[PDB]
Amino acid sequence: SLLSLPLVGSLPFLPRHGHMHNNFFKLQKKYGPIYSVRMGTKTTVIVGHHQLAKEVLIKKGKDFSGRPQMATLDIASNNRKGIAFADSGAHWQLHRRLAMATFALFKDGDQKLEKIICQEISTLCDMLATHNGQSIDISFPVFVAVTNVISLICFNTSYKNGDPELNVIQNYNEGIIDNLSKDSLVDLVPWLKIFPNKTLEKLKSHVKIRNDLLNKILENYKEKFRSDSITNMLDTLMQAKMNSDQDSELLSDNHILTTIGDIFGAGVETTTSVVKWTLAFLLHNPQVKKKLYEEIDQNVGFSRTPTISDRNRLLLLEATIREVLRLRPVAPMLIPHKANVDSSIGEFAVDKGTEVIINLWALHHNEKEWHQPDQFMPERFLNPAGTQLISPSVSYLPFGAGPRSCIGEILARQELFLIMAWLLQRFDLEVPDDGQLPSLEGIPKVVFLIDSFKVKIKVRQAWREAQA
Ligand code: HEM
Numbered sequence: 001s002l003l004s005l006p007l008v009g010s011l012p013f014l015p016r017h018g019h020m021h022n023n024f025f026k027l028q029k030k031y032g033p034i035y036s037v038r039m040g041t042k043t044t045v046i047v048g049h050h051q052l053a054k055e056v057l058i059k060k061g062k063d064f065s066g067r068p069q070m071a072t073l074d075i076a077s078n079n080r081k082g083i084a085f086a087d088s089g090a091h092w093q094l095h096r097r098l099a100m101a102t103f104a105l106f107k108d109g110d111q112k113l114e115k116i117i118c119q120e121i122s123t124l125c126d127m128l129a130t131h132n133g134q135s136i137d138i139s140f141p142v143f144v145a146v147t148n149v150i151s152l153i154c155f156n157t158s159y160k161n162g163d164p165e166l167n168v169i170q171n172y173n174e175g176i177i178d179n180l181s182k183d184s185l186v187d188l189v190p191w192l193k194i195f196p197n198k199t200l201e202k203l204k205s206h207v208k209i210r211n212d213l214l215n216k217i218l219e220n221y222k223e224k225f226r227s228d229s230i231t232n233m234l235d236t237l238m239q240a241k242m243n244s245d246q247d248s249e250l251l252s253d254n255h256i257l258t259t260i261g262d263i264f265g266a267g268v269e270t271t272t273s274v275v276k277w278t279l280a281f282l283l284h285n286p287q288v289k290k291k292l293y294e295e296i297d298q299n300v301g302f303s304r305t306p307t308i309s310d311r312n313r314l315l316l317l318e319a320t321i322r323e324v325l326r327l328r329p330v331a332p333m334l335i336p337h338k339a340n341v342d343s344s345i346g347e348f349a350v351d352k353g354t355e356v357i358i359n360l361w362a363l364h365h366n367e368k369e370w371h372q373p374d375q376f377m378p379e380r381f382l383n384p385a386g387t388q389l390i391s392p393s394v395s396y397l398p399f400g401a402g403p404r405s406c407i408g409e410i411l412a413r414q415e416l417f418l419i420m421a422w423l424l425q426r427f428d429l430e431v432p433d434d435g436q437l438p439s440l441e442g443i444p445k446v447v448f449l450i451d452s453f454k455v456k457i458k459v460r461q462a463w464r465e466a467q468a
Pocket residue numbers: 083084085096262263264266267268270271274325329330331334335336397398399400401403404405406407408409411412413
C-alpha cells in the first residue's frame with residue numbers, strides 16, 4: 001500500500017514531438033473540442049470544433065479579438081505596433097482600417113490589381129523559361145514576383161532585376177521567421193525564459209536590418225509625398241498622419257513603419273509559401289495536374305494569357321487552391337487570440353486575458369465534416385459534374401473570420417490564381433531527374449512552410465507551337 005508521488009507538473013503530450021496543431025488535434029479524442037492548459041499564471045484554451053470556433057471569431061469576435069503578449073512578437077512588431085501582433089485597441093483599429101482602405105483602391109483602374117500582378121508574373125515566366133530543361137528551386141523567383149507586387153502596393157515601387165536589396169530582404173525574412181518561434185507560435189513551455197540562449201539576440205539583429213531598410217524608404221518618401229496623390233499604402237498612412245496633426249500619436253513613424261512591415265512581410269511569405277505548397281501537391285498528383293492542363297487548354301488556350309475573369313472557366317484550378325488552403329493552411333492555428341473581457345465559449349467561462357487558440361487544422365481535418373480529410377481531393381470543392389464550385393463543409397476558414405480575419409485575402413486569391421494559371425499554361429512542371437518528391441509534411445513556423453525542393457521546368461510542347 002504505497003503512496004503516490006507528489007505531482008508538480010503535468011502536460012498532455014511530449015513537447016517538441018510532432019506538430020503542435022496535430023498534437024492538440026489528437027488530444028480531442030480524449031478531452032473534446034475545447035480544453036485548457038496552465039503555465040504559471042498564463043492560461044490557454046484550444047478550440048477544435050467549428051461551432052466553438054465561429055463563436056470565438058464571429059458571434060463573440062470583439063470579446064476575443066485581443067492578441068497575447070510574447071517576447072519575440074514584441075521585438076518583431078516594435079512593441080505591439082502594426083496590425084497582426086498589435087492588441088485590440090486604438091492603434092490596431094486605425095491601421096487595419098487604413099490598410100483595408102488601400103486595398104479597396106486597387107479595384108479596377110489605371111492600376112487594376114490584376115495588371116500589377118500580371119506584369120510581375122510575366123517577368124517570372126521569362127526567367128523560368130531560361131531554365132528550360134533544368135531542375136530548380138522556384139522559391140526565389142516567385143519571391144521576387146510577389147515582392148515587387150506588394151512593394152508596388154506599398155510604395156508604387158518595384159525592384160529591377162538583380163537588385164541586391166531582394167537578397168537582403170530574403171535574408172532577414174528567413175532570419176526573423178527562424179527565430180520568431182522554434183516551431184508554431186503556440187509554445188506550451190516557455191523555453192527561451194528557462195535556459196540561456198541567443199534567440200532574442202538574433203531576432204533583434206534581423207529586425208534591425210529590416211527596420212533600417214524600411215526607414216530608408218520612408219524617410220526618402222516624405223519628399224515624394226503629395227497630398228493630391230494618394231495611390232499606395234504609404235500615401236494612405238501619411239495622409240492620415242497629415243489630417244490628424246488623438247490620432248497623431250497613433251500614426252507616428254514607428255507606427256507607420258510597423259504597419260508597412262506587417263504588409264510587406266505578410267504579402268511575400270504567405271503567398272510564396274502557398275505557391276510552393278501547390279506545386280508540391282501537383283508533383284504528388286499528376287492526374288490532377290494533367291486535368292489542370294486540359295482545363296486551361298479548353299478555356300484559355302494559347303491565344304492569350306490568363307485573366308481574373310478566367311476564374312469562371314478554370315474551376316478545377318480554383319478547386320485546387322481551395323484544397324491546398326484546407327490541407328496545409330498558412331496559419332493552421334491562426335494567430336493567438338486573447339480574451340479582451342470575461343466571456344464564454346460553449347458556455348464555459350473564459351476569464352479576461354486568457355489566451356485562446358483556434359485549431360484550424362482540427363477544423364480542416366474533422367472527419368465528420370470532411371470526406372477523407374487527409375487526402376488531396378480538389379474534387380470535393382466541385383459538384384459531381386465538374387461544372388461549378390461548391391462549399392462542401394461549414395468547417396473551412398482558410399482566412400479566418402471576424403475582427404481579425406485576413407486583410408490581404410483578395411490580393412492572395414488573385415496572386416495565387418494567376419501564378420498557377422500562367423505557369424500551367426507555359427510549363428510542364430515535373431519531378432527532377434533525381435527521384436526526389438517534396439516532403440508534404442511541412443515545417444510549422446509562424447507560417448506553415450514546405451521544406452525546399454526542386455522542380456524540373458520545361459516549356460510546354462503546345463505553348464511552343466502557338467508562337468509561329
Ligand atoms: C494564402 C495566403 C493567406 C492566407 C491563407 C491568410 C490567412 C490568414 C489567417 C488565417 C489569419 C488569422 C487571423 C487571426 O489571427 O484570427 C490572417 C491574418 C492576417 N493576414 Fe493573412 N492570409 C494570407 C495572406 C495574406 C496577405 C497577402 C496579406 C497582405 C497584407 C495578409 C495580411 C494579414 C494580416 C495583417 C493579418 C492580421 C490581421 C489582424 O491581426 O487583424 N495575409 N491571415
